[PDB]
Amino acid sequence: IFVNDDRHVMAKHSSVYPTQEELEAVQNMVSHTERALKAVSDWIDEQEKGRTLRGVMRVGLVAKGLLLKGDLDLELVLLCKEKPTTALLDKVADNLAIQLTTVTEDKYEILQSVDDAAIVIKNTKEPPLSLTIHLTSPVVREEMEKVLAGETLPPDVLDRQKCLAALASLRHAKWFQARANGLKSCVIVIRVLRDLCTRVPTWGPLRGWPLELLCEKSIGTANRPMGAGEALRRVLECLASGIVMPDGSGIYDPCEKEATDAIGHLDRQQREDITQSAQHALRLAAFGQLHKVLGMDPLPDYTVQIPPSTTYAPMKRPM
Amino acid sequence: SHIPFDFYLCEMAFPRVKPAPDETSFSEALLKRNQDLAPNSAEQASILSLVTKINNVIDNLIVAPGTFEVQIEEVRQVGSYKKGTMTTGHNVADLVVILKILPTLEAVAALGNKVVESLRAQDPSEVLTMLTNETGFEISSSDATVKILITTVPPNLRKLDPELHLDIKVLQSALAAIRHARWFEENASQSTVKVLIRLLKDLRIRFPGFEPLTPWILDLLGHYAVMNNPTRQPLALNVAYRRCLQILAAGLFLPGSVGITDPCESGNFRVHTVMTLEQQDMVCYTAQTLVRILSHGGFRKILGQEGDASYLASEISTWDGVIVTPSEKAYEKP
Numbered sequence: 001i002f003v004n005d006d007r008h009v010m011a012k013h014s015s016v017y018p019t020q021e022e023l024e025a026v027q028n029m030v031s032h033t034e035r036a037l038k039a040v041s042d043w044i045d046e047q048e049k050g051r052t053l054r055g056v057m058r059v060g061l062v063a064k065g066l067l068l069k070g071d072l073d074l075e076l077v078l079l080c081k082e083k084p085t086t087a088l089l090d091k092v093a094d095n096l097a098i099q100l101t102t103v104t105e106d107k108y109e110i111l112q113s114v115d116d117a118a119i120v121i122k123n124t125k126e127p128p129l130s131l132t133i134h135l136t137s138p139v140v141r142e143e144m145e146k147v148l149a150g151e152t153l154p155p156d157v158l159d160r161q162k163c164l165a166a167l168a169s170l171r172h173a174k175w176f177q178a179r180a181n182g183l184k185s186c187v188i189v190i191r192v193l194r195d196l197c198t199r200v201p202t203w204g205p206l207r208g209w210p211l212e213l214l215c216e217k218s219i220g221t222a223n224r225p226m227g228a229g230e231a232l233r234r235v236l237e238c239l240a241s242g243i244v245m246p247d248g249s250g251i252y253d254p255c256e257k258e259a260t261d262a263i264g265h266l267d268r269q270q271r272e273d274i275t276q277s278a279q280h281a282l283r284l285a286a287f288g289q290l291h292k293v294l295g296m297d298p299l300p301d302y303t304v305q306i307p308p309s310t311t312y313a314p315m316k317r318p319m
Numbered sequence: 320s321h322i323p324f325d326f327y328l329c330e331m332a333f334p335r336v337k338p339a340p341d342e343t344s345f346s347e348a349l350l351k352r353n354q355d356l357a358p359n360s361a362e363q364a365s366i367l368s369l370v371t372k373i374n375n376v377i378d379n380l381i382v383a384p385g386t387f388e389v390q391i392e393e394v395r396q397v398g399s400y401k402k403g404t405m406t407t408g409h410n411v412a413d414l415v416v417i418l419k420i421l422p423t424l425e426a427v428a429a430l431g432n433k434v435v436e437s438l439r440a441q442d443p444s445e446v447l448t449m450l451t452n453e454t455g456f457e458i459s460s461s462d463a464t465v466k467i468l469i470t471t472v473p474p475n476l477r478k479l480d481p482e483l484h485l486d487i488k489v490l491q492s493a494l495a496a497i498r499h500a501r502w503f504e505e506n507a508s509q510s511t512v513k514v515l516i517r518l519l520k521d522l523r524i525r526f527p528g529f530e531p532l533t534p535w536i537l538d539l540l541g542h543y544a545v546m547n548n549p550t551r552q553p554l555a556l557n558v559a560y561r562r563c564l565q566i567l568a569a570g571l572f573l574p575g576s577v578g579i580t581d582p583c584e585s586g587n588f589r590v591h592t593v594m595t596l597e598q599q600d601m602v603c604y605t606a607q608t609l610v611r612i613l614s615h616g617g618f619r620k621i622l623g624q625e626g627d628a629s630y631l632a633s634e635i636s637t638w639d640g641v642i643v644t645p646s647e648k649a650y651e652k653p
């Protein structure tokens with residue numbers, strides 16, 4: 001079904017897909033940061049026994065395999081047994097600077113953001129890669145939950161809000177690997193559309209978690225496996241129906257206990273505009289002009305981007 | 320084999336974040352608008368009477384054709400009259416008559432005469448006018464009309480000639496009218512379903528973009544809207560009405576889509592393929608504009624309760640600060 005569309009979507013896909021050079025670089029930086037942090041953990045455990053850092057998990061683009069040509073922002077989540085404190089932040093950063101030398105000689109700038117509840121690492125390539133380590137702890141949400149429910153309960157605890165957001169993205173990682181990854185053409189289409197959200201300011205507000213949900217919901221609700229071409233269309237058809245308009249159903253966040261709308265931030269006009277755009281994009285595609293939507297001229301296992309951690313070593317969408 | 324998106328085909332996958340809005344005024348207005356479009360008590364009595372009178376004459380004619388020259392095989396009520404989707408202002412009913420002999424312009428006229436003549440003999444006080452046409456013949460009182468679509472038997476179609484016998488097009492479209500009538504009475508005879516088809520006719524009349532939409536297509540569409548859904552239950556008028564727009568918007572009747580298959584044909588014919596690509600684009604983007612207009616709370620305008628609104632789908636409009644730009648042409652001739 002729609003052979004040309006398959007061709008064009010897949011062709012535009014290549015254009016946006018990382019470079020063996022880019023990926024090789026990202027692979028190394030992440031691999032270093034993981035081995036490093038692992039070492040930072042051991043050092044703390046032993047230094048104490050005479051558990052604190054529970055584990056290092058991949059989130060965001062790196063986890064979801066949503067890296068595209070020109071991406072410099074990587075992310076990671078450091079889980080703690082307790083609510084992360086300014087002190088622990090420092091402890092980690094300094095030892096990280098050290099533990100790095102145990103695995104690599106590449107220079108890494110290290111800057112901690114107490115106000116961002118994270119540690120940033122930059123390499124020395126041009127342009128530089130930037131890996132953010134978010135510190136958080138399940139305890140932070142457990143308490144928030146109690147807080148909301150009006151239930152009774154250190155001096156330098158990191159921003160709870162930021163921490164809740166880190167836990168959140170970790171959820172989104174796991175969700176994506178379980179729901180989206182296995183779903184045929186979902187990932188291909190999410191990248192290709194992530195590009196569209198960037199090229200077109202109108203699709204701007206959709207970029208990220210919302211767009212990922214949208215694609216899984218629309219592609220997954222099909223009665224059969226689709227190619228990249230058909231699949232993408234079905235994502236336009238869904239948008240065109242007015243799924244995002246104010247009185248619509250909204251996008252239900254599968255990773256929140258209190259019913260949340262994924263596109264709840266979109267104001268009235270933004271919604272109107274996206275719909276209007278998606279509606280037009282559909283018919284264009286329908287009338288053999290999909291290339292216009294993709295931003296290209298008519299032509300005459302894509303999921304794995306980097307291998308899974310060997311340091312902090314998978315569910316799949318049922319066949 | 321591509322089925323365009325339809326929210327009500329997978330409602331489960333789109334949990335509601337907050338309770339559905341109160342569409343009481345929209346629903347109430349939907350009925351209000353219907354009461355205005357529905358025939359009055361006088362019209363119903365008119366078309367009733369006239370159709371009843373004629374049908375009997377034909378019935379009779381079949382059994383004891385007597386020394387009459389034209390043998391009729393059968394008669395079947397069809398169209399909005401039978402379907403229950405008539406409209407105030409257009410008091411016309413349809414009846415298809417199957418002739419055993421090859422339909423000639425001359426027999427059609429001979430028949431129209433025998434009928435009307437027998438109607439003026441049973442009630443000379445009743446003024447009637449009888450005129451023949453391309454399809455067959457028609458008889459009209461001062462209050463209502465009845466169109467007799469003349470056809471024949473399948474065996475004859477193969478033996479038909481273009482010089483003496485009506486066009487095979489007219490003869491077969493009549494035969495199809497029968498099927499549509501049957502199918503409808505077996506599948507579409509639901510309250511809301513009828514009320515929707517009526518509203519759909521009106522919408523199509525007030526938005527020139529919906530013009531390519533034939534009546535048969537409007538039936539099939541109105542049915543889909545209400546009835547076709549996992550849960551064997553009819554949708555509410557307000558929900559299926561918005562859905563009509565939504566499915567057109569998602570490109571139900573666009574190229575590459577299975578759209579709606581004709582239940583009254585063979586084997587798998589896409590009803591919308593009676594439309595040209597240009598028209599498909601139009602029906603779609605017209606529906607698309609209205610989907611958005613509806614979301615901004617303009618159901619009165621979209622229903623025709625606030626005068627002319629055809630402009631809503633060609634000009635910019637602002638609804639409570641939100642600037643609405645009507646969807647535009649995307650089809651590219653040769």
Ligand SMILES: Nc1ccn([C@@H]2O[C@@H](COP(=O)(O)OP(=O)(O)OP(=O)(O)O)[C@@H](O)[C@H]2O)c(=O)n1
Nearest residue numbers: 398399404405406413492495496499500534535
């Ligand atoms: N060229 C035609 C004419 C008629 N029909 C069949 O018979 C028609 C019925 O008569 P029509 O006047 O065309 O539509 P109505 O149902 O009568 O609608 P309305 O009276 O409101 O105009 C359609 O339903 C269709 O089923 C058809 O298929 N093709």
Ligand SMILES: [Mg+2]
Nearest residue numbers: 398399411412
């Ligand atoms: Mg009629």
